[PDB]
Amino acid sequence: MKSVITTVVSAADAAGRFPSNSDLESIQGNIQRSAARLEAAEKLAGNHEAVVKEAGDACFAKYAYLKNPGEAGENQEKINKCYRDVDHYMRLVNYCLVVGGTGPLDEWGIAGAREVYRTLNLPTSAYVASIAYTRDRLCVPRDMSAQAGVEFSAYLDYLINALS
Amino acid sequence: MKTPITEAIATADNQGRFLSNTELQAVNGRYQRATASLTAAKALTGSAQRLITGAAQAVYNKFPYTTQMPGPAYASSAIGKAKCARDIGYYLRMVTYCLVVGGTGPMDEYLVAGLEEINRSFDLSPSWYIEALQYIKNSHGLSGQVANEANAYIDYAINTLS
Amino acid sequence: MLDAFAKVVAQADARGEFLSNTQIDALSKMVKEGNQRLDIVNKVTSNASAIVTNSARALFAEQPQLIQPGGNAYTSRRMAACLRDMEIVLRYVSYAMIAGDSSVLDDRCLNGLRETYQALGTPGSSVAVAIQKMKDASVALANDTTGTPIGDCSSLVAELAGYFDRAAVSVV
Amino acid sequence: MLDAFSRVVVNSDAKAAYVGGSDLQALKSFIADGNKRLDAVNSIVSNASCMVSDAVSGMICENPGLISPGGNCYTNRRMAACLRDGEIILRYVSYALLAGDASVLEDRCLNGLKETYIALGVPTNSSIRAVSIMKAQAVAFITNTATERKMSFAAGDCTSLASEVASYFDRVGAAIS
Amino acid sequence: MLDAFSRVVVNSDAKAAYVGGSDLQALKSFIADGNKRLDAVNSIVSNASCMVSDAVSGMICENPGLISPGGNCYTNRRMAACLRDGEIILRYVSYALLAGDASVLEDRCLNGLKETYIALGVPTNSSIRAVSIMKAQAVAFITNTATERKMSFAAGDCTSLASEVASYFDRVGAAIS
Amino acid sequence: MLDAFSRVVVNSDAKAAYVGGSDLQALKSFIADGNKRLDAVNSIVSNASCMVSDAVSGMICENPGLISPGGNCYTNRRMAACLRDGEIILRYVSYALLAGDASVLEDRCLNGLKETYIALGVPTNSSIRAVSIMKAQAVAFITNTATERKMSFAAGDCTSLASEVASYFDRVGAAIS
Amino acid sequence: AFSSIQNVLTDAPLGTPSAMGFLDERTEKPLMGPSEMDELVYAVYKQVFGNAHIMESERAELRDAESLFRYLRDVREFVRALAKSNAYTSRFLQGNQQYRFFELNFKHLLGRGPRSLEEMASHSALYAEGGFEAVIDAILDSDEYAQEFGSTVVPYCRFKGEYPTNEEFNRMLVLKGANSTSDKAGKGRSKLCYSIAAGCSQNWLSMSKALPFGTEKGTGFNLISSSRNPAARPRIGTKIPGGVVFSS
Amino acid sequence: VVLPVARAGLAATAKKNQYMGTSVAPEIVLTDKGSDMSRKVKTEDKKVAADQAAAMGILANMSLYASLNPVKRMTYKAKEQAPAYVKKTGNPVEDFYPSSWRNMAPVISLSAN
Amino acid sequence: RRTVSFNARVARNKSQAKKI
Ligand SMILES: C=CC1=C(C)[C@@H](Cc2[nH]c(/C=C3N=C(/C=C4\NC(=O)[C@H](C)[C@H]4CC)C(C)=C\3CCC(=O)O)c(CCC(=O)O)c2C)NC1=O
Ligand SMILES: C=CC1=C(C)[C@@H](Cc2[nH]c(/C=C3N=C(/C=C4\NC(=O)[C@H](C)[C@H]4CC)C(C)=C\3CCC(=O)O)c(CCC(=O)O)c2C)NC1=O
Ligand SMILES: C=CC1=C(C)[C@@H](Cc2[nH]c(/C=C3N=C(/C=C4\NC(=O)[C@H](C)[C@H]4CC)C(C)=C\3CCC(=O)O)c(CCC(=O)O)c2C)NC1=O
Ligand SMILES: C=CC1=C(C)[C@@H](Cc2[nH]c(/C=C3N=C(/C=C4\NC(=O)[C@H](C)[C@H]4CC)C(C)=C\3CCC(=O)O)c(CCC(=O)O)c2C)NC1=O
Ligand SMILES: C=CC1=C(C)[C@@H](Cc2[nH]c(/C=C3N=C(/C=C4\NC(=O)[C@H](C)[C@H]4CC)C(C)=C\3CCC(=O)O)c(CCC(=O)O)c2C)NC1=O
Ligand SMILES: C=CC1=C(C)[C@@H](Cc2[nH]c(/C=C3N=C(/C=C4\NC(=O)[C@H](C)[C@H]4CC)C(C)=C\3CCC(=O)O)c(CCC(=O)O)c2C)NC1=O
Ligand SMILES: C=CC1=C(C)[C@@H](Cc2[nH]c(/C=C3N=C(/C=C4\NC(=O)[C@H](C)[C@H]4CC)C(C)=C\3CCC(=O)O)c(CCC(=O)O)c2C)NC1=O
Ligand SMILES: C=CC1=C(C)[C@@H](Cc2[nH]c(/C=C3N=C(/C=C4\NC(=O)[C@H](C)[C@H]4CC)C(C)=C\3CCC(=O)O)c(CCC(=O)O)c2C)NC1=O
Ligand SMILES: C=CC1=C(C)[C@@H](Cc2[nH]c(/C=C3N=C(/C=C4\NC(=O)[C@H](C)[C@H]4CC)C(C)=C\3CCC(=O)O)c(CCC(=O)O)c2C)NC1=O
Ligand SMILES: C=CC1=C(C)[C@@H](Cc2[nH]c(/C=C3N=C(/C=C4\NC(=O)[C@H](C)[C@H]4CC)C(C)=C\3CCC(=O)O)c(CCC(=O)O)c2C)NC1=O
Ligand SMILES: C=CC1=C(C)[C@@H](Cc2[nH]c(/C=C3N=C(/C=C4\NC(=O)[C@H](C)[C@H]4CC)C(C)=C\3CCC(=O)O)c(CCC(=O)O)c2C)NC1=O
Ligand SMILES: C=CC1=C(C)[C@@H](Cc2[nH]c(/C=C3N=C(/C=C4\NC(=O)[C@H](C)[C@H]4CC)C(C)=C\3CCC(=O)O)c(CCC(=O)O)c2C)NC1=O
Ligand SMILES: C=CC1=C(C)[C@@H](Cc2[nH]c(/C=C3N=C(/C=C4\NC(=O)[C@H](C)[C@H]4CC)C(C)=C\3CCC(=O)O)c(CCC(=O)O)c2C)NC1=O
Ligand SMILES: CCC1=C(C)/C(=C/C2=NC(=C\c3[nH]c(/C=C4\NC(=O)[C@H](C)[C@H]4CC)c(C)c3CCC(=O)O)/C(CCC(=O)O)=C2C)NC1=O
């Protein structure tokens, strides 16, 4: 993947160097910031059914043309493969909060994704309408702490800017 | 081998009976205690080289004649210093066997049966080994019931030497 | 007499090795099962008289020459010795089940039972039919709940049937 | 490559699971003992030049036919290539101790190493012996039980880091055997 | 000499029954695994000469008193017989793995081996110690986890043939005890 | 009585059980929307003889290599065995629609199904094609969008049940994949 | 980065005199002259083409790329002009598979073998966006080409000692052969194709044919298997004073 | 020391469910006459049977559906079926035109659909 | 032999940019 540890040991490997003191200064910051992003990870783990339920129907409320015949959300199995493909993305945000890097997003969920949605006529604006709904639905002292919300929202709009 | 499992089987075989609940409760007590016994065995194995070479130095500091006096019985040469640290490692290895098994059965068989005749023959003092075993009891760094399990076999070895 | 924990300690001491972390974890899987092994043994010893008596009554109905006059289980002396020989084998299988290792089974029951019955004239073919009848009477009794929290115990009842298979090939 | 947090999320990806609070208690103790992991790897890279030259010349000591005519540490050409190789092995196991997962040692260093050595003529039994010396040098710097060079640590056990790095040195012997 | 099919007929002849029903359904699943057993006998016969010379050498490195003057493996006449004594044991185990029944092992090799070895003065402690090395090699070749050579098989699980070949090798050690 | 409706399946024989008029009246107030679900399973099993007659012939309609000489729905009897197992799948799905869960389907019909089809040489890439025709018939018959036949239903929406009976047909397709 | 084979047992790499001639304002380069010129062109023809043995009526179609090379003395522009030729695509693109064409671009233009499937699949990502000229100019205008060869020397097979993967040295030795070895001998059929996509390695006799003179070409082979078993878990024990510790 | 046929027959009996090849299935029958006390559901168990005769209404009709496809007789090409074990006699009016295929010809009878 | 303070095709550029 790409994380804080794989950055500094592949920067060290290309120079032929041992782990120096600047590389161990980085992973001190992985220790200090971990209690934030492992609280947002285990909050999204035990609440993932209700946050993809609300993200799914905010897609079709903004775009009700998908339930026109011939379109993407034609029948109920195509509605059900829309709620699955946004439950895949909230799994990868949970994978990115645990790893502490953008690694599981850009090679399990973003790599190849513009090619497959262009062929299969899926609009990307419906995908970013769901993810941007959950970024505003977060509030600061109830759903997590104030620093877990900065980690959780930063992995949400990295996914938004990759699809835009 | 004297384990809590094979003391229950040997109790039922000496009476010619099936395993009643008197023997199923003794086996169940080993399973309830095997959590703390098997983490103590992992933590003493990972600290083996630190505890052996540190406890050989504790004997050389309390009994400093054992590095000066000539003769085959002392740690005064290359082969005597090598045989002293080999014996601390024998004692540490049998404690980890007793924690895995669950009773003082490995070191009764492999270590204490015939140990008094060996120390008197080869002129080894049993107060040397007590001092190295008091170092291991005060330097493994374990806490709680994991330390209670490890300490109960370290001073079983002390009571056979003292 | 070795149980399953002492089987790996004895094999380590022949090379002078500490036990590794991958061997402590394999032993804590046995502590993890634990309560389900104790209910295999509790179900066998609490029905031990029905397991032996129903398997003997079915054995003589199949080989009736064993209780004919002049047969090997005629004359109460020989009949009563046939019944405790079946209860001896069922006793040591339940010993080997609670230990996890078949050391007490084939050291002090099975070691020399083929050539014990050969010197007496006892048909060891017919003894193996009696082990097989006590085998499936015990594995049908092991995998029923009847006041037991329901789970998967099929890796333990495959171990219990392997002890009965070990006793069966050893007497003939 | 992966590290100790990436290894957990590829296990959950085979089940399409979420990394929840049951799986997170291994990762919450990796960051809890994470100061000692950093405290152990500058105990190794501070002594790494002494560790290589002692392990290679300690292999020459138990096998003097490596430096006779026909040994494969004979001239200056072959001895500097052996000293370079033991520094590469010690470099990749310091990456693997830092990550907490032996992925980067196994694909970059160890993958294909057995076929280089049986084409260049390198003896693999004595090459395992140079790795097995510096395994014992590495566990003595971590637990602070070396005869020279006492470093200044804080008090407690590092006994699970000393056997984690001993398993990384054991993968080098298993891959060239 | 019984195979696995002759054992279920001898058991049915004692009660004078026709073979059929439940024990005919246990026999149809024995032949469903009949290619795994044929795949795995081949993975031992193919490595049979390295399996013996490694087990005899590994018994010697543990007890170097066997190659001292006066040891049992001392002279060239006695070294060549231990290499022969140790591959007959492996040959008769491969018959029992192919047959699926240890009858040919127990009577053509094991009946009276203990009385033979303590009449020639062969240490039965070391013979057990070489047989237990060949046990670890045969479970590694069947499960395809050898560190020295990986074979080619179809994908699947063969952990019941490893449990069976370990029971045959444990029986060799218990017999010559 | 729904717990007794699993009793008639578990005995591996024939037992008939039913509910009364007063018993079902308690059932439809206990469970949610049960008048739709009894209308759901009546719409399938009234047309169940046409559903497996169209799906197995629809499998040949795009894959005529099964009735090719050398295929698997050749020689007179394999076509009759395929029509039996198409009707086996339809009664377990319609019982899973009736009971409300897939808990009777995955253990009593799909457990062991993948290993049985590859033992017989049944082409499992075409049996998923025969399930998806039966899935496409089922969502037509629930939502009354079947073109050649229109039943008489009370008005309302049944797309929750049609997504439920579609999801049981993927569970048949996930086990044989 | 010591590399005991490189300038010891092989030759020195050929090329132009210096790279300071470009900053000279009355010339473009140390002018070699047509005996010092064409023996450098003999080494570019033996390296971009393998030993293809190009005829007199095949070199006449490369007349224009040499006439620019003897005025503009850049070696990298000569290699770029020879890889877009008909004589480079009729030998390495026309009757070959796609990973055979890709594995010869690493041989002819970098002197190494490809290290990965991820590095190899990105070269087919450039085939989709510009054809074969997008593969060739991205190798030539890379950072790895700049800090090993530049405009000055021919791209030669370099024994580095400090390879970023050990497998990269193995695939370099399979790709180059002996000096009596061209690269048309397989019928298409990339040699490295199975080992890149699976992750295994090469065969020891195929690598030791291509090693230089004086480097133990083949010894070290035990008579058992040549690769490793990934599923094997061996017991490797260390002696302490008391017993033997299996730190696993 | 082990019995291979016994401890693999037992291992294949607990993992594999007892219920697969018996071809039983829950047949549901709904009865409804409109009234409230007419609405039983009967979920009984029947061993379903392979109906031999109605497969020929499927196997033959698809064999002439695929006979008349112009573009499924290519991209779905059948294998090369051997003829049977009939012996050649020597007279061509029995060898080339046997009694099982004597005077047989297809007659096509079109109607509406 | 590469001499790191060196380029290849901006050397083409600036001789046809100082004239511009
Ligand atoms: C994993 C991440 C995660 C989230 C982002 C939230 C998202 C979220 N919020 C609500 C539900 C709610 N959330 C809020 C909170 C607010 N609404 C506002 O208008 C205020 C701006 C804000 C105060 C902070 C309120 C008031 C409700 C109930 C009303 C509603 O449905 O929005 C629900 C419905 C279930 C519930 O009530 O808990 C969910 C899933 N929950 C999560 O588990
Ligand atoms: C781990 C990451 C990961 C993903 C995100 C998904 C991505 C994904 N979704 C779909 C597949 C689909 N995705 C949708 C999705 C939608 N329709 C809409 O109206 C919206 C655009 C959106 C719901 C919000 C639909 C309708 C299909 C079916 C399209 C088809 O049948 O071709 C497919 C095609 C194959 C299939 O059917 O499975 C893929 C690869 N898969 C993954 O592995
Ligand atoms: C002194 C005598 C003595 C015993 C008999 C056992 C009795 C016993 N068994 C279990 C606990 C159990 N017992 C079983 C056993 C089985 N379940 C089945 O369906 C099979 C019929 C059988 C297989 C052998 C299982 C599976 C559990 C654990 C429950 C579970 O996790 O599913 C527990 C509770 C443990 C816990 O969950 O905390 C106890 C006290 N223990 C004893 O100390
Ligand atoms: C033939 C010649 C010959 C040698 C060169 C040495 C080589 C050597 N060194 C060590 C062993 C060691 N080597 C070192 C390394 C060092 N110690 C320091 O304090 C320095 C910082 C650093 C470079 C000198 C350490 C720390 C140990 C182990 C701890 C110890 O010696 O107690 C070991 C023991 C490894 C083992 O037990 O398997 C051996 C064989 N021995 C020989 O027989
Ligand atoms: C990233 C992974 C990586 C490695 C592991 C090394 C592996 C490696 N070693 C050597 C090359 C060599 N390696 C050795 C090493 C040894 N011979 C011995 O007898 C000792 C046992 C042992 C030293 C400990 C020798 C002697 C050579 C040179 C062989 C020769 O001159 O013919 C080469 C050939 C390349 C060259 O030198 O030009 C390579 C790839 N390099 C890497 O890039
Ligand atoms: C950026 C670089 C960087 C480092 C080099 C380390 C430095 C370091 N090590 C420890 C801290 C520690 N280090 C040890 C380790 C040991 N004590 C012993 O007796 C053993 C010999 C040795 C085992 C290897 C222990 C036991 C602690 C305290 C436990 C803990 O807080 O983690 C601490 C925390 C305590 C403190 O703040 O003072 C720090 C900052 N951390 C970093 O961030
Ligand atoms: C059917 C199975 C079968 C066997 C097992 C052998 C058994 C066997 N081995 C030996 C003979 C021997 N067997 C050994 C073997 C050993 N000594 C050791 O120290 C090692 C522990 C061990 C090797 C692993 C030796 C050394 C001899 C030679 C004794 C002698 O020459 O007097 C002899 C004496 C006759 C002869 O040598 O020809 C016999 C019958 N033969 C068989 O037909
Ligand atoms: C003192 C001298 C000495 C020896 C000779 C060896 C002897 C030896 N070999 C193996 C262990 C083994 N031996 C082999 C056999 C082989 N492996 C191959 O790659 C070849 C094909 C084949 C013969 C060359 C195998 C396959 C294993 C286990 C797994 C593996 O190594 O891949 C074991 C481990 C037993 C165990 O795990 O408990 C031992 C002690 N060890 C020593 O300490
Ligand atoms: C006369 C010569 C002769 C042989 C050598 C064997 C060769 C052989 N082995 C298998 C087939 C197989 N072999 C294995 C065995 C293994 N797979 C593993 O992962 C383990 C490492 C290893 C031992 C457990 C497995 C799992 C199969 C798959 C089929 C099955 O399960 O039976 C097959 C059938 C599959 C195929 O056709 O490819 C054949 C022919 N049979 C013969 O007739
Ligand atoms: C309740 C349990 C139960 C099932 C789940 C089904 C599954 C099933 N089908 C068949 C058996 C079969 N199944 C098929 C089916 C097909 N072949 C095709 O080409 C099509 C894809 C598909 C039908 C649409 C055929 C052709 C046979 C007969 C195989 C033969 O006789 O060679 C068998 C026979 C195995 C045996 O008897 O040993 C079983 C269990 N039948 C059951 O009894
Ligand atoms: C086993 C016997 C048995 C049945 C078959 C059902 C039959 C049934 N369902 C409904 C009643 C209904 N049935 C449906 C169902 C549907 N409407 C649609 O548009 C879809 C096509 C279809 C879904 C599959 C709906 C939506 C209602 C009204 C809501 C309700 O009563 O649940 C009614 C009342 C209609 C009326 O008032 O006359 C009856 C008798 N109940 C039973 O006890
Ligand atoms: C694709 C574009 C392209 C062109 C348009 C031509 C143009 C061209 N000609 C020459 C190069 C030359 N051109 C000539 C030709 C002549 N000199 C004379 O005196 C005659 C009048 C005339 C023949 C008609 C000669 C003699 C040289 C070589 C000069 C030298 O020896 O340095 C060069 C320099 C390259 C070199 O050093 O050889 C170039 C670019 N070549 C090309 O590649
Ligand atoms: C179910 C049984 C069945 C049939 C018997 C035929 C009958 C038939 N033919 C055509 C339709 C036609 N039939 C012909 C054929 C001919 N016209 C000529 O001028 C030629 C003399 C003769 C050639 C043999 C032509 C040219 C058309 C119109 C083109 C077309 O519809 O494809 C139509 C469609 C007319 C309409 O759309 O209303 C029908 C039903 N088709 C069937 O499906
Ligand atoms: C596995 C069970 C086991 C135990 C417990 C054991 C003890 C043991 N320690 C011995 C010797 C020894 N032990 C020591 C140890 C010491 N002397 C000192 O000065 C130090 C203070 C002290 C070290 C702490 C020495 C120097 C010898 C050699 C004595 C001799 O050779 O006469 C000997 C004599 C064998 C020999 O000559 O090497 C035995 C049998 N052996 C065993 O097999």
JSON list of C-alpha atoms and ligand atoms in Angstrom, two decimals, chain H residues 110-113, ligand 13:
[
{"chain": "H", "resi": 110, "resn": "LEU", "atom": "CA", "xyz": [-46.16, -24.92, -41.25]},
{"chain": "H", "resi": 111, "resn": "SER", "atom": "CA", "xyz": [-49.10, -23.17, -39.64]},
{"chain": "H", "resi": 112, "resn": "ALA", "atom": "CA", "xyz": [-49.62, -19.98, -37.65]},
{"chain": "H", "resi": 113, "resn": "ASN", "atom": "CA", "xyz": [-46.62, -19.67, -35.27]},
{"chain": "J", "resi": 13, "resn": "LIG", "atom": "C1", "xyz": [-45.42, -19.03, -39.08]},
{"chain": "J", "resi": 13, "resn": "LIG", "atom": "C2", "xyz": [-45.11, -19.33, -40.32]},
{"chain": "J", "resi": 13, "resn": "LIG", "atom": "C3", "xyz": [-44.64, -18.28, -41.26]},
{"chain": "J", "resi": 13, "resn": "LIG", "atom": "C4", "xyz": [-44.79, -18.23, -42.71]},
{"chain": "J", "resi": 13, "resn": "LIG", "atom": "C5", "xyz": [-45.47, -19.15, -43.69]},
{"chain": "J", "resi": 13, "resn": "LIG", "atom": "C6", "xyz": [-44.20, -17.03, -43.31]},
{"chain": "J", "resi": 13, "resn": "LIG", "atom": "C7", "xyz": [-45.31, -16.17, -43.90]},
{"chain": "J", "resi": 13, "resn": "LIG", "atom": "C8", "xyz": [-44.92, -14.72, -43.92]},
{"chain": "J", "resi": 13, "resn": "LIG", "atom": "N1", "xyz": [-44.15, -14.11, -44.86]},
{"chain": "J", "resi": 13, "resn": "LIG", "atom": "C9", "xyz": [-44.05, -12.82, -44.52]},
{"chain": "J", "resi": 13, "resn": "LIG", "atom": "C10", "xyz": [-43.26, -11.86, -45.32]},
{"chain": "J", "resi": 13, "resn": "LIG", "atom": "C11", "xyz": [-42.59, -12.07, -46.61]},
{"chain": "J", "resi": 13, "resn": "LIG", "atom": "N2", "xyz": [-42.62, -13.24, -47.29]},
{"chain": "J", "resi": 13, "resn": "LIG", "atom": "C12", "xyz": [-41.91, -13.00, -48.42]},
{"chain": "J", "resi": 13, "resn": "LIG", "atom": "C13", "xyz": [-41.69, -14.08, -49.42]},
{"chain": "J", "resi": 13, "resn": "LIG", "atom": "C14", "xyz": [-42.09, -14.00, -50.70]},
{"chain": "J", "resi": 13, "resn": "LIG", "atom": "N3", "xyz": [-42.69, -12.95, -51.25]},
{"chain": "J", "resi": 13, "resn": "LIG", "atom": "C15", "xyz": [-42.36, -12.88, -52.53]},
{"chain": "J", "resi": 13, "resn": "LIG", "atom": "O1", "xyz": [-42.47, -11.90, -53.24]},
{"chain": "J", "resi": 13, "resn": "LIG", "atom": "C16", "xyz": [-41.80, -14.17, -53.00]},
{"chain": "J", "resi": 13, "resn": "LIG", "atom": "C17", "xyz": [-42.67, -14.69, -54.13]},
{"chain": "J", "resi": 13, "resn": "LIG", "atom": "C18", "xyz": [-41.84, -15.03, -51.75]},
{"chain": "J", "resi": 13, "resn": "LIG", "atom": "C19", "xyz": [-40.50, -15.68, -51.54]},
{"chain": "J", "resi": 13, "resn": "LIG", "atom": "C20", "xyz": [-40.64, -17.14, -51.24]},
{"chain": "J", "resi": 13, "resn": "LIG", "atom": "C21", "xyz": [-41.35, -11.62, -48.50]},
{"chain": "J", "resi": 13, "resn": "LIG", "atom": "C22", "xyz": [-40.51, -10.96, -49.56]},
{"chain": "J", "resi": 13, "resn": "LIG", "atom": "C23", "xyz": [-41.83, -10.99, -47.27]},
{"chain": "J", "resi": 13, "resn": "LIG", "atom": "C24", "xyz": [-41.61, -9.57, -46.79]},
{"chain": "J", "resi": 13, "resn": "LIG", "atom": "C25", "xyz": [-40.24, -9.38, -46.15]},
{"chain": "J", "resi": 13, "resn": "LIG", "atom": "C26", "xyz": [-40.27, -9.80, -44.71]},
{"chain": "J", "resi": 13, "resn": "LIG", "atom": "O2", "xyz": [-41.30, -9.57, -44.04]},
{"chain": "J", "resi": 13, "resn": "LIG", "atom": "O3", "xyz": [-39.25, -10.36, -44.24]},
{"chain": "J", "resi": 13, "resn": "LIG", "atom": "C27", "xyz": [-44.76, -12.46, -43.28]},
{"chain": "J", "resi": 13, "resn": "LIG", "atom": "C28", "xyz": [-44.86, -11.12, -42.60]},
{"chain": "J", "resi": 13, "resn": "LIG", "atom": "C29", "xyz": [-45.93, -10.29, -43.29]},
{"chain": "J", "resi": 13, "resn": "LIG", "atom": "C30", "xyz": [-46.40, -9.25, -42.31]},
{"chain": "J", "resi": 13, "resn": "LIG", "atom": "O4", "xyz": [-45.54, -8.61, -41.67]},
{"chain": "J", "resi": 13, "resn": "LIG", "atom": "O5", "xyz": [-47.63, -9.06, -42.17]},
{"chain": "J", "resi": 13, "resn": "LIG", "atom": "C31", "xyz": [-45.36, -13.74, -42.89]},
{"chain": "J", "resi": 13, "resn": "LIG", "atom": "C32", "xyz": [-46.21, -14.02, -41.69]},
{"chain": "J", "resi": 13, "resn": "LIG", "atom": "N4", "xyz": [-43.61, -16.32, -42.16]},
{"chain": "J", "resi": 13, "resn": "LIG", "atom": "C33", "xyz": [-43.88, -17.03, -41.04]},
{"chain": "J", "resi": 13, "resn": "LIG", "atom": "O6", "xyz": [-43.49, -16.62, -39.89]}
]
